[model samples]
Target: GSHMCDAFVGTWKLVSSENFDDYMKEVGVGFATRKVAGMAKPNMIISVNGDVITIKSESTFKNTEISFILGQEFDEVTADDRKVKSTITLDGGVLVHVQKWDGKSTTIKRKREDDKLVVECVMKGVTSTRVYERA
Candidate 1:
């Protein structure tokens, strides 16, 4: 499918987060790990060229970059720092990432909903959702 002007283009600040701790826990992160993850405010920058999407996530604590083709499956490391196999697709005009790791897989959906942009990450027995407005 064709993308519309790459809706994810440009830099996006971390406005807020929800259920971040639960996600860390499910990924087998300890208390100290959650504490560190919680303090980092990750800003994301996405660029789409032809069939490839490049994503850069940065914070005062850590930085990482990921690039993949739309509709192609690949391996990736999660924000909580877990390795996983993943594929991304568009759902309801939103970007959705499906990942498999450590005997579990997760689907993370991101979209601009109403006045806020929503990022919903779901895995077996757990779900985490975050919302952000233009900054």
Candidate 2:
């Protein structure tokens, strides 16, 4: 079987984000944290070794990293510092990432378009989309 997640193994820098603040709010992030986070652009670095995949986000205000195999749940501390159980699975060429904590959950879909990485985040009912370019 081909590893569809392999396509995401590269460095991607944020190019644009839309409605991210609202999405963060729905996830219970504080106002002050959201303000600070809204101003920073994060670089997403992805790597793979055998059956494990690692994704790291580096920003001026915070950094987060997670390593896991497909369909396996792992502990992840989000940018807002929430400890959640996260799992990432592949649907065709899309990476479906879901995080759950305290009865709340969020889904993030990552896919490639042209040479850009498109990330769609959904929490509660708010949706935020972020675009990144290969660096």
Candidate 3:
């Protein structure tokens, strides 16, 4: 059984993106970025203090980070980079966030597994998973 806890904050890099395309497609990512995603990889850095969490997604196309409360909704941009209201929570060792948009609401989950950082994304009924390793 794999369990998660406070031992889940650190710097990690995308090692195996797998079917990140499916995720983008489900979220209706523009055609151009879909082509460039493979050429550019992302680095993920996370820091935690008590109930506050900071997530930093680094890359040419994904230069965004957000400071979120454990169980409160705040105003920010969605994947389309437009402003929206979202909430984040950490449960069972998985960090979960929900981004709401006019057309879609995406739920993203990040977890640590045996020196690996695995991310799961859900948009409507379609879900995709991406994995990363310690940076």
Candidate 4:
């Protein structure tokens, strides 16, 4: 049936963005930062080694890495340096993460769509989608 999901390993380069500005604003990022943040492309590398998953978001402005295990809670500092409590789980074909900071929560989901990587970010009722091509 080919229903079994493929791996999320390897590198991906950003293809496009949607409502990323609003999503970043909800995360407390400023206008200038958001404006510039969108102008550059982001390349992400995901490595799944054993029980650990490492995600690296790289851009010209800044770079961040998040490491976690499935169904475990951990403290994280977001790309904007916001402290958060996060837990990630693999549901179906998606690698999903729920992060809580201050009094708000955000959800990030990652899935492989054919040869591309699709990421959906939801925060404060705003959803942003960013697609990536294999690099």
Candidate 5:
């Protein structure tokens, strides 16, 4: 059984967000910018082939795609548009992402907690986590 769950490989709706504004603030985005991003509905699409995973986030403001190998390290730009080198690993049934860029690094661990998928993004000075529900 080398395949990932098919249910995990599709577009997901951004039902709600938590600490997204704080993450924007940490990245030095202005209040107006943060407000706009917070209000926007971002949809995430995930495509998995073997151990490779491609994640795309689409919104009215921006569209970005990230491709990486599972349990391996790669470079990527965050949803907020920061360039970072990161790694993704499995923790239980979740994917854990650890990123390092510039002088700062962050660890984001995601898992299906209850009916929602929880993403725990943690940096040296801050930890901002978000949750997404199925569409």
Candidate 6:
């Protein structure tokens, strides 16, 4: 027996990235960090334990992990080293994550389509989409 919540419980590799640099800029990432992050193809590993879900991104430039319960807020230090209060919620089959720091906010949505996990990052009206293949 499998749970619908387990749909995203797997390792995913970044396959395609679009407009991520602009999104990072909106999030206040420096030029040097943005360049390195733009070139890095990260692997995202999603795991679930009871009511807690963890998403870990592994990359050559940096790595980040955020674990939280649905609809609950937690402190998260992003890959770019920004500390923010983050919350993740499940809306239909999409995982909606919102982070706020210093009066600035960003949203990241992840959804599974067919065999691919699509991630959309939004900050200050800038939207970036990154597609990941199941690994």
* lDDT (Cα) of model 2: 0.92
Sliding window of 10 residues with minimal summed lDDT for model 5: 1-10
TM per prediction: 0.87, 0.96, 0.85, 0.92, 0.85, 0.96
Question: Which stretches of model 4 miss by more than 4 angstroms?
Answer: 1-6
Candidate 4, residue 67: CA error in Å? 1.0
Error of 5 at 123 (Å): 2.2
TM-score (C-alpha) between model 1 and the true structure: 0.87
Query: Which lDDT tens digits does candidate 5 get at residues 23-95?
Result: 7787666888789888887887888876678888899977888888877888887766788898888666678
> Mind giving the per-residue lDDT tens digits that candidate 6 earns over 2-42?
35456899899999999999999999989999999999999
RMSD of 3: 3.1
Candidate 3 error regions (>4 Å): 1-6
Query: Which 10 consecutive residues of model 2 have the lowest summed lDDT?
Result: 1-10
lDDT-sorted candidate list, best first: 2, 6, 4, 1, 5, 3
lDDT of 4 by residue, 1-135 (tens): 323223787889999889999999988898998888888788998886667888998998889898888899999998778899999988887889999978899999988887888899999789999999988
**Tens digit per residue, CA lDDT, model 1, 69-106:** 86899888766677888888776688888888768777
* Candidate 3 lDDT by residue in tens digits, 1-135: 222334566788887766677778777777787767755787888887666678787888767778777789988865446676788886877778888877668898987777788898887777778888887
Error of 5 at 54 (Å): 1.0
Q: Against the correct fold, how does model 6 do in TM-score? A: 0.96
Better of 5 and 6 by lDDT: 6
Pick by lDDT: which candidate is best? 2
